[PDB]
């Protein structure tokens, strides 16, 4: 068992360290199970990535396994049909869950909703083997090999989704696994054969692979069916996914600060390391600080240090992000430590055999409360991440709050383009759904089995709900990522415009008013005050169409001219002429800057000029590798383009598949 | 709109259910904006019923005059396209490459929901308040009638300007948006195609949306109302099945029909739905020879009265049944008699009105209450079941409802566990969704109903309760068979007790008044003991019972000349008699078809209907036990699944109706 | 800050620290010597000592601390600033409190105010957090708060109104307004032997205190922050740790009352096979408590009728159930230690060394809310466990022959603990509902500037209520288990005397008939087995019919074993009657012997483990809560069961039980 905290789940280990180690798990080389070494990255590799799995090729391991079986046998001989019958009675009553009776009920894209996901089953078989290699259980090596042969030949039992309370542990689903390797006549398994997914009787599948059904002996029924492997499996997958979504939340925080031209100062070490040293608060601030280095969108503390109700500081979704995310990150790191012991270093069947002291012990290690605990806490965390990113996104999509970004992140006139409005509403919906999911399952314990099982963990049910919260959070975070990238591109257009328009203002002022200001000290003042009036006004006319927007801005500026140049000989006609020429100039320049953006490939986006080098990684991933482009607008284009949803879907799919995972790692390196 | 409450003691859930199940499925549903009822909605959504706007000049004129009022061009077309563009923002699979056996469409709304939504949407627009053209309404009925169903994301709506996003998918489909997909059955198989491809296959033309038609189509509550209607329909059936299971559990437990006597409800605590539930159960128990009847009934800590899961069942179910009846009234107005888009046009008074009829709180309200009610039904039936599966509590039913020696048969033990698991799941599902409202859309939508999310949760609760009630039905039928075997045994064993007493002890009792006393007292001793040893294997069980009875013989026959050897010999003979008779009665049960089950001799005539439905039509038999049989039979779960499927498909629905009227 | 994990808690599971270690350190906090605040050393035990036990508090007497505070003020650097601070308080003094004493009634009136202990803990943490030199709040302002603490002047603060972001703004503003002598500020003081609520200036004049006038940054310095939430959370976590330990003590004592198996706690089943550090801890605590018990069945001894041979899950899975929630409590301890003792939580914050200020979010109390959400779910989990233990023990069908309802005399007229069985269900149900999260109910507060807000204080209030309800439940369990233990002791004393009586009666009635045979040993063995099995199931019978039933069954055994003898049925019936009569009379005698003696001579003391005897004596002797014989048997309506459970509840709430728990473990 590893003492490296990056494996095992304090400032001496971080979520990024944990993720890096998980993502480094081999997928090609064989996972050798020894009862103690198995880690959560390994579990995910076997469950999801088809990694080969075997009991460690070791005389010590074999001898430990064999000696527990022998102990039981010899104890029995000193104290076989009926033992075989007892195991059959154990399976009989536990094969009691609901599955489709026939293929006749299957429909396109539907039909296996009442069965456990194949990956969960694979993860369960892996953990089950590991937990029996420890020598406490008296299950034969040939039985463990039956499981590893199922794994290595891609035979995955079809197991009901529901029916366990996760005490004598995950009895029912583990009984389906045991029935499958033993060739129960009514056991079904999933295989790929001749290029097709098939569901076959267990004996048919085994015959394709020349595998022999096992016949369960003394203690092997309880050895296989008592335990926590199914909930631990699903919980491990859910925690893996939650870690990624936590890192993505941090990344989206950074990109939002950039789109909002907000303050990187929120993440300064003084505000965390020095003043409020919660290790995971320090961690999160440091990740976001790292991501914002080099940004030309975010405002930097080290540069900053050089009667209107003016909002000068960022609102809480950005400014309190480390303080909001830190606590839940600590919970995810704690959960990692718990599940590592549970999945990798625990014997969870019963009774358990102490061969050295010739004793069989009656305990409770199948009570999966440690697993349920991780899932309750993680699901609440997912809801908290979701609330944060929703509040960041909805601020950014609010024209009144978003520091002058176009209404709805529309690229063209907002009168006929509401681009991200639907997504604002979707984000709300996902967030609401997360809130209800977050209520605990573990307060709903029933007096099961004649109250023998009066306390039961409900870990698998909890794991299921947390897996659904992962899914909903992925929809929300895919949505946010879609939006922030649009905002980044629109901000970059604003920056390109300002490069050209700053000089244009000065020039028009000189052309129109220079002679009237000759011999005065009015020019500096005028340029300064006209710029300030334009800036302040434009921030608030971000829902106006282009033409009236610019006439409005310069109308306001003309009032500033009246004041600043009130001593001069200028006619009202001359000031109005300046106003009109300046507005026309701004309107033309805007159109030209937009055309320069849209007429070139996304690989030439001006955003690449301003993004942090680290946040550019994620930008490039979505825009180039995923093909998700900025959206100019169906009405402007006179074309109903592939939908916003179709594009968000591509982001979501990259989250769910884990394609985005190495991207997050590279950014946070 | 119907004033019949089946569309207060004046209208019951059975009445409502009867009316729903009587909805035609073949004849065209004609939509007139007022008449549409929930059974109609279900028939269109699930049973493929043809749908049309009612063929009438009065309806057409109403529709055409609203359009004309509004009229009395390119930019209007563009505006509808901008409305759709931003609402087409939900997540669906990007390619078939992601589909897998049994999987793939989890991120889309069920097809029946989408059909129900189209049906409600058309109805709501026939009312003449919306300025959507008849040709647009006919585009929707044409999709319904050709089985063209838009593929619509599962998630994204908050159910205020109502169900905007999913309605926008429907609108984009009939308008042939280039990225709209639809499901159809064509050339005998399910396909997902682009909308224009699909329309070409059935010779339909896309509509081009004009002024107000984008909001007329996308603003409103049809999607949430559809899903909720389907959920309520299913919740009504589960409610009735709960009552049927209550009655059958009273029978299995040889419990008291007296709990359901009108004095206890109609007279003393007249909550209308309590009276209703008690009356349903009372009707089901009439004629049972398993349940004990009030009109026949009239220092050891014994339980004589039934525990609460049975005795308080009308008081427990009554309140939730009232909620379901209320929900029915609300959804009937929402689904059948409401205009939910905005702004709305008053043609008679020549005015437009800016309102909020898209705020689907009436729908959410139904779904939150229903989901709490499903948890309450589930808790009831779980408590009844787990009592019945507890050997210490179940009035002498075999442990785990094993048919043969329990040492090697734990029959329903896994189902006891499963039932707990289902119940726990229902409890968590029953927390409100509606308290998680977020400040959506720049706080323009700062209150939003979350009706569709609620409806989805309630739909999942229906599914979990279906698993639980299938489980309970499976178990109760096994218990009924075991109780019938007990009763057949008793028929032969009463006379055996007497004959053995006479054979072994007759001579010693001659001239005395001891025989009646001994028979009575030995019967009492045996009955009291056997109730407690229902976990013993057959052979030790009977020796145990007669060993206790031998103590009674010692007391009652203390004056006699009998040797201890004589009393022991009786004890042995009587135990061997009982063991053999038990084996005989079991053989007689197992060697005949279930159509001759002795359960049929004792079940009420109404509960017999459900017994026969499962045992004969679904083919789910009593289970004798894998070890006894030397065979690993088709699993318990396989058989429960057959029952669950009959519940989900609605096949059970007419059975329930038959039993209850 | 202490690197001692017993002070610090731990963010991960570790065998290097335990809940007992953490409790021991908390209970060792001085109550008399002055707590010196230095910005770093303050621990959770210290906070409770100041909040609840009146410990004096001062800013540490050091030039370094003084200079540090003074230098931040000077760095930051007037009628205008005074006005600004008053504007800040004005809008935050917006909560609800009773307008007058006219609304007060006996036992009621201050429900809409924060408990005084919470406000004292808050002031203590506030002053800590500002001694760190990042805030530019003057020492004289910190001394104003320490003077309030040391003179027992406690601001009356509304219970509700904060979302615990710019942190606990409203309640912290009430505290600020009080030390600055706001004309509408009320405070609580004890003066001339009575509790008084006075205006802040009135109270200050009693103690010769001068109001402070708030300067630049001092408004935000005082009102921005997490001290109120952290205070209430600290108190709730302290109480939860005690309830966690009590749960484990109750587990042990229920094993004893149930004559259950000590084997569930053997280290092979934890340390070796499933080494979650806190599972190991909990099993070790219960193992230690059971050592030497003569009620619990031991393993260095212990090693076709559906007989249950192993303990049910409430006892057998107790370490696996409690372990996870104990790890959460330890984690919460580490989190709150930093938040309460080592954190600056106002804003903006001043970096004097680099001559700059920083705009951050350290008032966002999510760390505190996090602890309270997990703790409240943990309390529900402890409750569910102890409820299931208790209700099994109170179930005659499941409790291995304990009298029905733990009635000491005939059950037909005594239902002793049945009401408590129902009450335990009620408490458990209430805990379940309390355990739903508060943190999922965040509103877009303050023009969405505060669009995320921690809701720590609300959460802490709910966790506090859960501690109260769990205290009711555990008081109830404790009451019941002590009765069960006395009843089991009575059974044991009976069995000691009845075993010989059985042999004697067999010899008397059957000796002659068995002469020349080997039947005697078999008869005794099988009669004993018959009696034992039957009696386990007849625990709801009244005494007289119980014994006739038991010996009627045993007579059946006699018929079999002595089937070859010459005995008449009259002879066997006569034995049955004499034997029942003997058992009945012996039971009455054994009962009288128990009830006639003092509880300091209870026979329970012959069988209880030496550690569990400690809790038994605390309740029976120190609290004076005795076993209950029965109102009907006694012919009198004694002081109620509820009155007695209330004494136990009071001992839990006051903390009097805490040193007892420590001593046992």
Swiss-Prot record, chain A:
Q: Which Gene3D superfamilies match?
A: Fumarase/aspartase (Central domain), Fumarase/aspartase (N-terminal domain), Phenylalanine ammonia-lyase 1, domain 3
Task: Write down the chemical reaction(s) this protein catalyses.
Answer: L-phenylalanine = (E)-cinnamate + NH4(+); L-tyrosine = (E)-4-coumarate + NH4(+)
For this chain, the Swiss-Prot or TrEMBL PTM comment says: Contains an active site 4-methylidene-imidazol-5-one (MIO), which is formed autocatalytically by cyclization and dehydration of residues Ala-Ser-Gly.
Report the EC code(s) recorded for this entry. Answer: 4.3.1.25
Q: In which pathway does it act?
A: Phenylpropanoid metabolism; trans-cinnamate biosynthesis; trans-cinnamate from L-phenylalanine: step 1/1
Task: Cross-link 5-imidazolinone (Ala-Gly): give the residues.
Answer: 167-169
Q: What family name appears in the similarity comment?
A: Belongs to the PAL/histidase family.
| Protein name as it appears in the record | Phenylalanine/tyrosine ammonia-lyase
Organism, scientific name: Rhodotorula toruloides (Yeast)
């Amino acid at each position: 068992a590893s003492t490296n905290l990056a494996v095992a789940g304090t400032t001496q280990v971080t979520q990024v360290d944990i993720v890096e180690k998980m993502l480094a798990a081999p997928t090609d080389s064989t996972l050798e199970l020894d009862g103690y070494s198995l880690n959560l990255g390994d579990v995910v590799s076997a469950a999801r990535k088809g990694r080969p799995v075997r009991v460690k090729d070791s005389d010590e391991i074999r001898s430990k396994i064999d000696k527990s079986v022998e102990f039981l046998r010899s104890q029995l001989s000193m104290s076989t049909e009926d033992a075989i019958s007892l195991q059959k009675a154990l399976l009989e009553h536990q094969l009691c869950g609901v599955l489709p009776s026939s293929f006749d009920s299957f429909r396109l894209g539907r039909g296996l909703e009442n069965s456990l996901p194949l990956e969960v089953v694979r993860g369960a078989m892996t953990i089950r083997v590991n937990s029996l290699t420890r020598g406490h259980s008296a299950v034969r090596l040939v039985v463990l090999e039956a499981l590893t042969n199922f794994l290595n030949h891609g035979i995955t039992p079809i197991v009901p989704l529901r029916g366990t309370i996760s005490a004598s542990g995950d009895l029912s689903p583990l009984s389906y696994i045991a029935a499958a390797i033993s060739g129960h006549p009514d056991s079904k398994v999933h295989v790929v054969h001749e290029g097709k997914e098939k569901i076959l009787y267990a004996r048919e599948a085994m015959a394709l692979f020349n595998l022999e059904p096992v016949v369960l002996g003394p203690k092997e029924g309880l050895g296989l069916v008592n335990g926590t492997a199914v909930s631990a499996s699903m919980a491990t997958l859910a925690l893996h996914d939650a870690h990624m979504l936590s890192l993505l939340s941090q990344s989206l925080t950074a990109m939002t600060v950039e789109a909002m031209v907000g303050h990187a100062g929120s993440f300064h070490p003084f505000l965390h390391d020095v003043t409020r040293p919660h290790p995971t608060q320090i961690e999160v601030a440091g990740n976001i600080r790292k991501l914002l280095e080099g940004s030309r969108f975010a405002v930097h503390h080290e540069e900053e240090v050089k009667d209107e109700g003016i909002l000068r500081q960022d609102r809480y979704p950005l400014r309190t992000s480390p303080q909001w995310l830190g606590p839940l990150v600590s919970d995810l790191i704690h959960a990692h430590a718990v599940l590592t012991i549970e999945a990798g270093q625990s014997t969870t069947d019963n009774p358990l055999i102490d061969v050295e002291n010739k004793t069989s012990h009656h305990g409770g290690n199948f009570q999966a409360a440690a697993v349920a605990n991780t899932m309750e806490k993680t699901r609440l965390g997912l809801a908290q991440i979701g609330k944060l990113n929703f509040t960041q996104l909805t601020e950014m999509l609010n024209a009144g709050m978003n520091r002058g970004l176009p209404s709805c992140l529309a690229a063209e006139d907002p009168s006929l383009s509401y681009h991200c409005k639907g997504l604002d509403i979707a984000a709300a919906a996902y967030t609401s759904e997360l809130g209800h999911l977050a209520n605990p399952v573990t307060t709903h314990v029933q007096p099961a089995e004649m109250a023998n099982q009066a306390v039961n963990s409900l870990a698998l049910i909890s794991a299921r709900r947390t897996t659904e919260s992962n899914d909903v959070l992925s929809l929300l975070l895919a949505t946010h990522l879609y939006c922030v990238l649009q905002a980044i591109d629109l901000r970059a257009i604003e920056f390109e415009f300002k490069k050209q328009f700053g000089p244009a203002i000065v020039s028009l002022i000189d052309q129109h008013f220079g002679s009237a200001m000759t011999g005065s000290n009015l020019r500096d003042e005028l340029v300064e005050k006209v710029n300030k009036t334009l800036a302040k006004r434009l921030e608030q006319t971000n829902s106006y169409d282009l033409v009236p927007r610019w006439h409005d801005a310069f109308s306001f500026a003309a009032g500033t001219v009246v004041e600043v140049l009130s001593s001069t000989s200028l006619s009202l006609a001359a000031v109005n002429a300046w106003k009109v020429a300046a507005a026309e100039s701004a309107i033309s320049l805007t159109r030209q800057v937009r055309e320069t953006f849209w007429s070139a490939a996304s690989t030439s986006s001006p955003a690449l000029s301003y993004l942090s080098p680290r946040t550019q990684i994620l930008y490039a991933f979505v825009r180039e590798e995923l093909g998700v482009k900025a959206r100019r607008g169906d009405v402007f284009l006179g074309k109903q383009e592939v939908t916003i949803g179709s594009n968000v879907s591509k982001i979501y799919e990259a989250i769910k598949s884990g394609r985005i995972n190495n991207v997050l790692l590279k950014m946070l390196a």
